[PDB]
Amino acid sequence: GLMQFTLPVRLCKEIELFHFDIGPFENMWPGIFVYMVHRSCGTSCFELEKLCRFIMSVKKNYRRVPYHNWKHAVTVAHCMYAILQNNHTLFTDLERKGLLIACLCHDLDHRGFSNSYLQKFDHPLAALYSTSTMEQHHFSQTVSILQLEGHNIFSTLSSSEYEQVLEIIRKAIIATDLALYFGNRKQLEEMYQTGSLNLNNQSHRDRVIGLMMTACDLCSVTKLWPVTKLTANDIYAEFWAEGDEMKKLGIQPIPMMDRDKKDEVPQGQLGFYNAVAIPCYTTLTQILPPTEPLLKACRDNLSQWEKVIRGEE
Numbered sequence: 001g002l003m004q005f006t007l008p009v010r011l012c013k014e015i016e017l018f019h020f021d022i023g024p025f026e027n028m029w030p031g032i033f034v035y036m037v038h039r040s041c042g043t044s045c046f047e048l049e050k051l052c053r054f055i056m057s058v059k060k061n062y063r064r065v066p067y068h069n070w071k072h073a074v075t076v077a078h079c080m081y082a083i084l085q086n087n088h089t090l091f092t093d094l095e096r097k098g099l100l101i102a103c104l105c106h107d108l109d110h111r112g113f114s115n116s117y118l119q120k121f122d123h124p125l126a127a128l129y130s131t132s133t134m135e136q137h138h139f140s141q142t143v144s145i146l147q148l149e150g151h152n153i154f155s156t157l158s159s160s161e162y163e164q165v166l167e168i169i170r171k172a173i174i175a176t177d178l179a180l181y182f183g184n185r186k187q188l189e190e191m192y193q194t195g196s197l198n199l200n201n202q203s204h205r206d207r208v209i210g211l212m213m214t215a216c217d218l219c220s221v222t223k224l225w226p227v228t229k230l231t232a233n234d235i236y237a238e239f240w241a242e243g244d245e246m247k248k249l250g251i252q253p254i255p256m257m258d259r260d261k262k263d264e265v266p267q268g269q270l271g272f273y274n275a276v277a278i279p280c281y282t283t284l285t286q287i288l289p290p291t292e293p294l295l296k297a298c299r300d301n302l303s304q305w306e307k308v309i310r311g312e313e
């Protein structure tokens with residue numbers, strides 16, 4: 001109960017900032033996560049014995065893929081931590097519990113392949129879940145780990161609080177399906193402008209949490225340029241592997257997945273920042289003003305991709 005996690009001074013300071021990189025020392029990521037749960041949620045939000053066993057089972061269930069890996073899980077949880085800490089009063093105790101765990105679990109057992117590749121391959125998961133295929137898998141995997149003897153970090157919730165947090169986690173994980181983000185942000189955009197946005201309305205709260213999950217999921221575009229640039233390599237390592245596998249099914253990959261279009265990457269990043277990233281952080285900043293630093297970091301990185309195209313780097 002009196003056992004706090006403590007970080008070194010540079011991490012103690014930088015972990016509070018949106019652009020923090022969790023670093024290359026894997027053995028520190030669990031401790032970083034528990035630190036964030038303790039400060040965001042409380043030191044008695046979870047039984048430390050059960051949390052530690054939950055964290056290590058989650059880690060074991062992420063795979064050795066270039067991008068959709070354990071580092072990504074913890075990276076996405078830290079962006080949620082920074083959103084939650086900069087918005088103290090807006091979120092319930094259950095939401096602060098549920099959302100960090102959602103973020104840690106949101107890509108559980110990812111194979112490095114898109115929902116489209118599973119469908120075209122005709123993978124079993126594509127028969128079990130017709131839409132948001134991997135995301136329904138990720139929630140399934142989260143429930144299974146929670147049901148391992150000794151892994152129920154939620155045991156000392158009431159019956160209804162337990163059903164509520166699992167529903168928060170399910171919606172949060174489904175919402176990381178980028179196919180659903182476009183419609184979600186347009187709805188939130190209309191509501192905010194016409195003034196109908198209402199945070200006591202549960203269906204509105206759900207939408208807001210959806211956007212937060214997208215914002216945390218894409219947070220590589222909100223880091224310092226060298227982190228953004230080097231993460232993009234990991235993203236394309238998966239994309240181009242999927243493109244190879246499409247060619248093996250005798251399907252031409254979309255340009256995103258085609259290693260033969262390395263040359264156009266800087267222009268592909270522009271479209272992604274303009275069509276997805278900037279709109280996401282803009283609407284998030286309008287709803288939660290203290291998340292402005294994410295939008296400013298994203299615009300800085302947009303400007304860096306513009307410099308690469310103009311040959312300046």
Ligand SMILES: Cn1ncc(C(=O)N2CCC2)c1C(=O)Nc1ccn2nc(N3CCOCC3)nc2c1
Pocket residue numbers: 178218220221232235255256257261262263264265267268269271272
């Ligand atoms: C940075 N970041 N973070 C998350 C994702 C992402 O989409 N998700 C889905 C799972 C992670 C990306 C990303 O890079 N997206 C994209 C999206 C479209 N395009 N289109 C090209 N190009 C077309 C022309 O030819 C060159 C490539 N690159 C990209 C890169």
Ligand SMILES: [Mg+2]
Pocket residue numbers: 106107134176177
């Ligand atoms: Mg995902």
Ligand SMILES: [Zn+2]
Pocket residue numbers: 072076106107176217
């Ligand atoms: Zn993800």
